[PDB]
Write a protein that binds this ligand. Structure first.
Ligand SMILES: NC(=O)c1ccc[n+]([C@@H]2O[C@H](COP(=O)([O-])OP(=O)(O)OC[C@H]3O[C@@H](n4cnc5c(N)ncnc54)[C@H](OP(=O)(O)O)[C@@H]3O)[C@@H](O)[C@H]2O)c1
Ligand SMILES: NC(=O)c1ccc[n+]([C@@H]2O[C@H](COP(=O)([O-])OP(=O)(O)OC[C@H]3O[C@@H](n4cnc5c(N)ncnc54)[C@H](OP(=O)(O)O)[C@@H]3O)[C@@H](O)[C@H]2O)c1
Ligand SMILES: [Zn+2]
Ligand SMILES: [Zn+2]
Ligand SMILES: [Zn+2]
Ligand SMILES: [Zn+2]
Lengths: 359, 359
């Protein structure tokens, strides 16, 4: 059983089948090694990936499954060789917890692109055991995967930056869309979406938000500072913005029309897919061929950059607009997420609400 | 009527409806302007795009339509402002005959990416008249769009370089796949494919040919010099070559699986689509996200690069493997092309067989 698998006892909420239903779950985590760092989970943002996983949208999920990879907390214990963190420090873990550490991806600081990269949850760790997420009391990871929380960065509103944040930030840099004056487009004003707008503006880019929810317009223009708002379903409106974007970050979590998006790209424009629909997308070759445009994909970021991201976010006072919930509210939160009903990001107040849920 | 439109009488073969039936057609062309170069058509390769066009695969097609954009002939006349071609010179005309000549892509020798770019056939010229291609007797184009054939370049075997040639050459240079060490892949050993292989080998690159016709394995390996042949519909075969290509030039003229191509690509590898399928292709986001891979589009090339491409081919003894046909064989050749039954390139011998078809 999972309660006997490791020495130190653990508690959290897990799904047992593709119904995605979460409920108290008893498990355990490995003992704290020389390079590991142990910390009490204070907060953990709810990412749409946690939803896809528990519902088995990709048919990769193995149960029981404990989601959560936007973890934030307080260090309690650390191994003898730990160097950058002490007990009492505020730290966080993202979507990565390990890799092979020897290929060229790792050496170049891209543990996220290692063929043996280990995901924070629903993956197989170096010891062959199933990895469990941040929807739990405590966490333990190698110092290399431990992010340091700047002192002026709130523990709850900065949590989603660990995944949603690093994920949109990374592509804006790598594809040269973090240049002032440039015109960037963010498809889907959701978790990753609204964070992107914030980094894009922070870089000094004129920003266009492409959404299916006209009731987010005002918030997009007036709170996130987007310079333009487009309802992807209104062709007259879309067509007007034809060839105005140097690049686009697509965070859409479901299959959706790509043609219209290309139509918004200037010549040689770039479409960066970051969202993960359960099914294949429709790509019209002439959309690429006409203009020599490209469609690229990006997944989170390596550990190094993830750190550069939170530091940057803390300097510019960038944070996720969140809604703090109780552990026992997880099921309702998940349906609300599936139904586009969260004003950007749910974050679980694990510290003050997890314990009370044990039978 | 097309024969009254202009002052100089022309003759060729056109399609009148989407059945694609080609037959004699009487039209005309504008008079030789100050910067124009007039020439007698001697040859005209047959590109699959001609077939798509005449069957209206892309819905754009308009009739009557005269295909042909791999035109080679002898200059019969030149305006007073022509600088590099004299009467009697061997010239070529590719997919372009015009453009705005007053924007960034044109100013950067990318007439092909100009929004007002003009296609050799089925497009509207600067004088607002429809353009008819190379399946005709004579031809006339502004000096800018005239390719000067190199002395050591056969007119018939070099005709397809004017389109098939530049289309695979451009991406090879633009996406950095033009150098030894790079392991390149070419999908679809057809008109553009076999030529794509030659340029590739010429650049010193190692090459992998992905085909659906096992009976081409030898011509590819022994004659083109491919370092490896793969049968797309062979799991075990394809599987083995996973993650071994720095980039791929996809020339397929129809819908086909993409997942297998991303499978062959290395981390950060590039898939370059040059084939113009009729329907969109399936694109699983994970394939790109998994290893930050790219899917780019590319169409022919700029005038400057086209001239360079053929000068490169000449120095490297590169020509298309063709099959010369009489004009009256057009409909049979069109049926054979559609059935992937041409050992690389049908080339109309216009200079010796058109006139004999004029009623
Ligand atoms: N590759 C990576 O590294 C990585 C990292 C994190 C997350 N992801 C993936 O990114 C996606 C988004 O996660 P979130 O950002 O966590 O999700 P979310 O908050 O649910 O936001 C998704 C946003 O997209 C739009 N959307 C939803 N359904 C849509 C539909 N049928 N058609 C068009 N637009 C739709 C909505 O925006 P509008 O109201 O503006 O339309 C929705 O606000 C998920 O697939 C997740 O798995 C990938
Ligand atoms: N974007 C541009 O600038 C540009 C320029 C010129 C042409 N094109 C387009 O490029 C394509 C190829 O033109 P060609 O090179 O002129 O055509 P082609 O000679 O017909 O060659 C196409 C080659 O692809 C493969 N093929 C055909 N049907 C297939 C299918 N259902 N599944 C998998 N492979 C298939 C065959 O190769 P195997 O026997 O090896 O499978 C065929 O030899 C056309 O769509 C054309 O319109 C684009
Ligand atoms: Zn996530
Ligand atoms: Zn590695
Ligand atoms: Zn062509
Ligand atoms: Zn132009």
């Amino acid at each position: 059983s999972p309660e006997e698998e490791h020495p130190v006892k653990a508690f959290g909420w897990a799904a047992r089948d593709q119904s995605g239903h979460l409920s108290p779950f008893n498990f355990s985590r490995r003992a704290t090694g020389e390079e590991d760092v142990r910390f009490k989970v204070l907060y953990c943002g709810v990412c749409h990936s946690d939803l896809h996983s528990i519902k088995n949208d990709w048919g990769f999920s193995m149960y029981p499954l404990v989601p959560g990879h936007e973890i934030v907390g307080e260090v309690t214990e650390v191994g003898s060789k730990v160097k950058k963190v002490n007990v009492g420090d505020k730290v966080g873990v993202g979507c990565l917890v390990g890799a092979c550490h020897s290929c060229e991806s790792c050496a170049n600081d891209l543990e996220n692109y290692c063929p043996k990269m280990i995901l924070t949850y629903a993956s197989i760790y170096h010891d062959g055991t199933i990895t469990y997420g941040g929807y739990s009391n405590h966490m333990v990871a190698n110092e290399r995967y431990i992010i340091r929380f700047p002192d002026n960065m709130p523990l709850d509103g900065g949590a989603p930056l660990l995944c949603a944040g690093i994920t949109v930030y990374s592509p804006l840099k790598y594809f040269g869309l973090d240049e002032p004056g440039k015109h960037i487009g963010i498809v889907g004003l959701g978790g990753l979406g609204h964070v992107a707008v914030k980094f894009a503006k922070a870089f000094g880019s004129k920003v266009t938000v492409i959404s299916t929810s006209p009731s987010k317009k005002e918030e997009a223009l007036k709170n996130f500072g987007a310079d333009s708002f487009l309802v992807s379903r209104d062709q007259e409106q879309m067509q007007a913005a034809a060839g105005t974007l140097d690049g686009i970050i697509d965070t859409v979590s479901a299959v959706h029309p790509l043609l219209p998006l290309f139509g918004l790209l200037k010549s040689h424009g770039k479409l960066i897919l970051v969202g993960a629909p359960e099914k294949p997308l429709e790509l019209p070759a002439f959309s690429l061929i006409a203009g020599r445009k490209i469609v690229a994909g990006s997944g989170i970021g390596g550990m190094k950059e993830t750190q550069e991201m939170i530091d940057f976010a803390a300097k510019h006072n960038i944070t996720a607009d969140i809604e703090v919930i109780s552990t026992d509210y997880l099921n309702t939160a998940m349906e609300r997420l599936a139904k586009n009903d969260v004003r950007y990001r749910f974050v679980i107040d694990v510290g003050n609400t997890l314990a009370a849920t044990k039978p």
